[PDB]
Point group: D2
Chain length 494, copies 4
Amino acid sequence: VCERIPDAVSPELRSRALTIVVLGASGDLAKKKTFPALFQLYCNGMLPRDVNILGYARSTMEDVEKWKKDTLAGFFTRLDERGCHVGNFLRRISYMTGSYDRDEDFARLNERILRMEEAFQGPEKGGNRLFYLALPPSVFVGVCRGLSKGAMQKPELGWVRLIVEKPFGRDTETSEQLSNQLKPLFNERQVFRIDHYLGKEMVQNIIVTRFANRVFSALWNSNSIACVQITFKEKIGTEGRGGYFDSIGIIRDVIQNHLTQILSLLTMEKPRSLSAEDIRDEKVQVLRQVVPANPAECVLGQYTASADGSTPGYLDDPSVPKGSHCPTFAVLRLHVNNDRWHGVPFIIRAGKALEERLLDIRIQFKDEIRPFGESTQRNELVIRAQPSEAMYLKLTAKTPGLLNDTHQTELDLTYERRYDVTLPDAYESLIHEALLGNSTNFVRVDELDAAWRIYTPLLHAIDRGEVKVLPYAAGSCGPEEAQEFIRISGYKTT
Amino acid sequence: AVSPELRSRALTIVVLGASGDLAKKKTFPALFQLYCNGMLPRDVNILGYARSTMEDVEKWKKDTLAGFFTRLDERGCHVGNFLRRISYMTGSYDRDEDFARLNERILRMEEAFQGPEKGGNRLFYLALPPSVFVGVCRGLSKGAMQKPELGWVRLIVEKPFGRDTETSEQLSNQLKPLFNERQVFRIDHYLGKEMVQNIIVTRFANRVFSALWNSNSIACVQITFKEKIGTEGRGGYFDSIGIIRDVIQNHLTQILSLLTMEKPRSLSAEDIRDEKVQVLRQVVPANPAECVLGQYTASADGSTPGYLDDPSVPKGSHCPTFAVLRLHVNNDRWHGVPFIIRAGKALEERLLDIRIQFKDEIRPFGESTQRNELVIRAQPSEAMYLKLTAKTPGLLNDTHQTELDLTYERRYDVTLPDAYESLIHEALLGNSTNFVRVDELDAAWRIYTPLLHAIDRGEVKVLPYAAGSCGPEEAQEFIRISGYKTT
Amino acid sequence: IPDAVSPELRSRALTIVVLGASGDLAKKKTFPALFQLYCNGMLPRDVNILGYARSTMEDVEKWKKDTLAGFFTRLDERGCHVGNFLRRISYMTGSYDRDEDFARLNERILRMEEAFQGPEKGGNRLFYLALPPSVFVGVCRGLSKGAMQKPELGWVRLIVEKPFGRDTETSEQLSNQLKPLFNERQVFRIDHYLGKEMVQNIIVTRFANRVFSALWNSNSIACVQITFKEKIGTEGRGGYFDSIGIIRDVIQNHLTQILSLLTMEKPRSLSAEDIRDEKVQVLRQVVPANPAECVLGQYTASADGSTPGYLDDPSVPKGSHCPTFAVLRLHVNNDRWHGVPFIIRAGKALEERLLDIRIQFKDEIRPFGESTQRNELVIRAQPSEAMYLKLTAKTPGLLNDTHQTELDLTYERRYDVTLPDAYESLIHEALLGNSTNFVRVDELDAAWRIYTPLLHAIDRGEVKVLPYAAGSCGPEEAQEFIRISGYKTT
Amino acid sequence: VCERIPDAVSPELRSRALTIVVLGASGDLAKKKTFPALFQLYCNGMLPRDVNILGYARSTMEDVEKWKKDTLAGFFTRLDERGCHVGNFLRRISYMTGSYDRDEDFARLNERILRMEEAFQGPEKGGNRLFYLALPPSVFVGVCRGLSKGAMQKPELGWVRLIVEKPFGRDTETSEQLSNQLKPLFNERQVFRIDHYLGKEMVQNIIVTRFANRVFSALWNSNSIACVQITFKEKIGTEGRGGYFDSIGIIRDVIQNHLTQILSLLTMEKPRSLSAEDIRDEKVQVLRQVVPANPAECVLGQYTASADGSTPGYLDDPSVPKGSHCPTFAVLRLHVNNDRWHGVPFIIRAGKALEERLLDIRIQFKDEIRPFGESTQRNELVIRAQPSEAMYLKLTAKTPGLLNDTHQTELDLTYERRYDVTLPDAYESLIHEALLGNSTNFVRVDELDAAWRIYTPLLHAIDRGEVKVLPYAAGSCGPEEAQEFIRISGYKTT
Ligand SMILES: [Cl-]
Ligand SMILES: [Cl-]
Ligand SMILES: [Cl-]
Ligand SMILES: [Cl-]
Ligand SMILES: [Cl-]
Ligand SMILES: [Cl-]
Ligand SMILES: [Cl-]
Ligand SMILES: [Cl-]
Ligand SMILES: [Cl-]
Ligand SMILES: [Cl-]
Ligand SMILES: [Cl-]
Ligand SMILES: [Cl-]
Ligand SMILES: [Cl-]
Ligand SMILES: [Cl-]
Ligand SMILES: [Cl-]
Ligand SMILES: [Cl-]
Ligand SMILES: [Cl-]
Ligand SMILES: [Cl-]
Ligand SMILES: [Cl-]
Ligand SMILES: [Cl-]
Ligand SMILES: [Cl-]
Ligand SMILES: [Cl-]
Ligand SMILES: [Cl-]
């Protein structure tokens, strides 16, 4: 049932105007993730009453109000509680057809931004501008140069922040050139490199789990931990738009960015404070100590057609080039060369067209050899980030009853069972943090370099045809070689 | 489903003191459950031996005895068949003629056995008043024993085991020539509770608890016993015992030994009992300065009368119905770790739990965090939960306290056995691990005797508290000052 | 003399200006260290050492030969180089407050820089400020105003000596007065303890070895003691001391540097800022010393009469309550050091000359009990630079029976090395642009924050100052306080 | 200079007569080790004034006084301080010719002992009789049966203790049969199985080093220790008497007994007390958790002639059978399957005809990866039991002086340079402890079984000709394959 939206905007966003410009408003990401997150933040009353959401793309628009009502509003989610606010929120959105390379079209955008900023009834003159760059990577530097050249606020009249989306190059060299191309354009402080995993409720809780608790603090090192596994599983393939993926692969898409962020949070030292800089300095520090993934210590897969025929093979896609050896699956063994993690194996898994949708972290502890031996098995801390948010500790306990034996049990915490809260999407958090000027859950220039350095030797070997890409039926668990590799790497299954 | 060892030879379970409140309320019901579980042989001989000159045994068995049996909605059809196994005998606890009469009957039952071995195993359950104990033991040893190489003889013995080190040592010396330690099964029913039996698994089958179980990670250990009930009617018995001798010396010291012991050499009985004795021998004797005592007064409204309002209770009695103690374990694992042992009657709730409180993680969260805590609740509802700090779910960067819970009533369909089912079974299976050993008993009395003597000399102050309240206010301040951080 | 000069010192001119050349510190510590670095071939042979002071001396050559050269040490090996080195020293009478005199200084440095036969046209300037604290900001303003080297023609580095204020407020003031004058990068705040061979080895002992690394936390360590003892009193310079006290003189600076190196976390690298960031970090977690957790002393005359009482000095004001002795219990509020007591000791007119670090480990209760006692890692920085670990071992022979033994390392026995003075290292490091063994602006603030509440309680007459005979071990109350604080002896 | 002997006999030995019977007095072990140790114990005033030393053997005597003066006294050591006491001590020794199998001669042995016991002027009647069995293993059970049958003291009139020398079988089965053959003859308490390593100053200090000190206690487990090495080196070969060695080998001679005792003391848990059975219970406990040595994880050698010709080859000995594959050298990798030692490699080395005489223990700790990396190396705890008794900890420190580099240093303790004490021979301690009834430094029946169980699968593989025995020149460091095996096993060289 429909209810009033509070004026709960952060006080640091009240005094001056607010213009959120979504560059690439026509794009799949903006319609599926950006505009829905803005709607939820508006409904939560976390954005000002008078925000200006400006869509800008090359798409010509015959009816912006039909696009807003039919296309945009279709992707909004809590419509049984917030369906009434759709109209009011959409009243805040405006659209603009413009190029990503022509200066006049960038003078147009700024003139509209000035026009909206002048409409403000609050105390301070000027305005704060947040730019969401949801564009194809071929136009990125074009937009950045254009925005920096003449879409910036006057000095001492409001902050200008830039939310930037992946891809961030294809390896160390291509990424480094993009970072150098952006260095004269904007300060590091104004760039907000999005990796949506850093906005997931269970990824945001890693740092608390680890450093607010002595139980995990005392155990979080090579003396107690035997193996660390990071898993990404998807039932969906890379169909329709599979030619886009052929150029990327599973390592560049999921492993380099998303699962390396989880790796940095799980392996970092305790931060000097909970400041952004202090947290990101520990993230860079550990990533700089990860030995580059080696081709011998990995397994790759590419999905074939499903047992029945429902899901077609990866190569059946017309966008996919003939005889492509692009991996849709990868399992890697990683080593962190420091005194906390010496000898602890890190198993990173990511695959498409698998048996289930999964995102979890598995901290498997050493066995307690005596006095139980075979009557016991490795404890494990499991943090499952999706489908259902849960954290559970797997242990051994006496079989309940008159029978004197052991069994495996769990000390569980299930978020759907424990809390009434309808959790926010990763993009709600991240967009909010960017408005609150909080950089901790945003990839730093050096944090990005450190990530590419782990995977580039491997990515290049793959691209040279040096690493074998094994087939697997869509809907199966992946190649059989992968489970043997996982076993041999150090992970004891349950 | 009987043990193959129990199949071969006759089995005679003799309950000495069958007319007593313990036998009817705890022994016979546990025997019924083992019989129903098919853990006892079908041709088992349960022989009640007491001073009661009762006329109608069949009426006693049907009306009195059967009334205390529990799963009658599931296994109450077997009442008749089980009761058909029970026989009764009037006899004295001091006359050889009455034990000769006992040996005579057990023999007439053993000879009736249709199995392979011509002898017969004897388990004696001594549920007697302590003034007749040595009398019975001498009588049973003199002429109620089984012939060599024709079946074992096992003696289950109930508390009290003296009142201090000297009186207990006396009793152990009186029993030494009568039976060998292996034959003696000293019952402490806490060692039969599902959560107490899981201590050893929790601690030594898991690296998570193993790594953390020492002074580097643990800040404080608390053992709690709470009862809403007072000395309701039978206050004259309690007056002579007190809360330390009743609960703390036996029950909570068993929990203390299992929580503080080193890792055993194996899961054998003596290897486990050797570690229990070892730690108890390193507990510094409780000091009168490091304790708080209470005696309950009438409840705020009047429902529960005061301890001294009981006519069985002598005038001006300074008997403690409540006690909180701080204990120190003088070894390298537990150096500096405070142990808080709590036991009281007429309190706010029924509770039996263990609290392992870990050190605070000072940085980087400071006030945004609080000590982790591993809580093991043995009753009212068998639970094990680990208290932690986590980010408040949602669109806010704050912290909150959460739990990684395991609740046995929610997780399992198993209707758990009574403490006496386990122990009686273990005694038939000849497993001594959950039975107080002669030296284990001495080590326990040595911790509390200096304190008990100080109390008995009128050296320790016994503070009043309203029945139904949390006890004296001095106790919570003592707990705080002892090392335990409240939430 | 070898050509062991660093290549950055070679291309450009080098001018080392010693401001306060007539001062006791200059003749006793600065000029002797410069001589050793010249002899070692660590300084260019065409170096310009310019003494700048208020002294109106007539004969510089006599001052250099008789006064200066008298304090030089290896003269059985380097006596022949005295002449050549002294030929590099020049002197210049001038004020610390007149711009014309600093202009005259700038004028001289430029004439010297123009005389250089090397490739570059500019010149590197190192200024050693060995001045009384009342003229400090005067000199800094004058030097910054017009004694600086042109842009892209050489670095300007400033070596600054203690006192750095008298508490947090006075120190903060001085740091703010210097902020617009020089970039922190150029400022080299000297604390000579960071140049001592045993203090320089703390970081290696601790983080290059798993034996000490595994043991360096509250689980294994029971007590940490830092000791400073001197047989010498004020002896002549009492009024000079009266205004400072033992805490401001030794404890706040010297022993807090040892405290930071002993308590810091493992650095991200061996870079200056990575090391100095861990030093600031721990100091920011030391709970401020409390007046209840300390013992103070002031020496009286020695049992016989040899050493007179502190108050017998005419420079010392009548009825002065200045402490010549202090023992303190300090707490470091972090997860590595929670519950570990830190006992910091410093006193004058005591039984012996000592500077050592004592890490006392927890007792192994069982199976030896009374047959054993706490292990101890002792690092003695002077009189005889050594490191030894105190342990329990079986009594050798047909007995059993335990005894206390040591696994020793004595530097004068094991090495033929004749170690450099603390000032040789640091002066060298300042020329090499290495800031790791120099007090950072924030590192200084963090140090004063520990002692200022206590220093103020002392200055308000709130803390009792107990007497002790010169040559004794100090007040008896101090030993009992040490015992009660957590330290056990035998 | 010559001085009076004190009456420093332990009070428990003062009360009743003492008869030390050396069975096999003509033997090389008695003349080289037993009688010299007795002389030192007599000189120390640790034996009664009126002891009776009775030599018993098969060897006919032509002049006992000449054997005593010329042969026996020749092996006595401190003759510049104790040369004057030689006469007085030798006056206590008597000799007896007799068999090791005929009862007739054991009745004579009992007859002489009672005669000596009756001569006692002290309080208590009867006598304490210590039997030192220095016999060839073919007569062992013969002697034990004879001594038990009728050379035992009357009940409640004095203890009868038996010192028994190696060999204790050749594997588990042969050892077990010998222990069962002795079970009805004597109680375990009365048997004192000698392993002379348990009498060495540095071996006796292991237990103190480890459990009286928190520095070593905290560090003594898999979290800090990377590798543990036990070394035995001898310059001597099997010169003249090779026939006896051929039947034994280096594993049965040194590794199974001597170095496994060092292994048990280095790996055991902390004892419940310093009582004999509390210490011996921990020794059995760890030995019962050592995985049996595997043929794949070992290197064997047999010495050839020295580079010059001084020391001849092992096979050049006529006592040595033709084409013998007996190992004079062995290096093994051992694993202790418990939570303290999981993953820690144990390297056990023993060889004859090597470069030097050595007996040392090396406890190599894990590297400290950061911040020093290559500027540092693994710390090590070295306990050298002979030639010179030193204990030293190897560490990294700053190079003294101006130079800001690192170097390797030591925190040393050398016993000849820190104590004035002329240390006793291993046999002085052990004989003394046997008189003082202290069993802690004597192999227990179960401790012996646990030792054989580690080496028997390997010994049998060797005896079946399944393990390769590599040659090495006498005086060299052994086969080159051994140093590569040591490296690969986990030990990082100096
Ligand atoms: Cl197809
Ligand atoms: Cl989901
Ligand atoms: Cl839950
Ligand atoms: Cl490459
Ligand atoms: Cl004790
Ligand atoms: Cl909750
Ligand atoms: Cl649950
Ligand atoms: Cl016992
Ligand atoms: Cl008492
Ligand atoms: Cl703080
Ligand atoms: Cl010195
Ligand atoms: Cl010494
Ligand atoms: Cl030395
Ligand atoms: Cl203040
Ligand atoms: Cl005679
Ligand atoms: Cl005997
Ligand atoms: Cl044997
Ligand atoms: Cl054992
Ligand atoms: Cl085992
Ligand atoms: Cl030697
Ligand atoms: Cl030495
Ligand atoms: Cl055993
Ligand atoms: Cl075999």
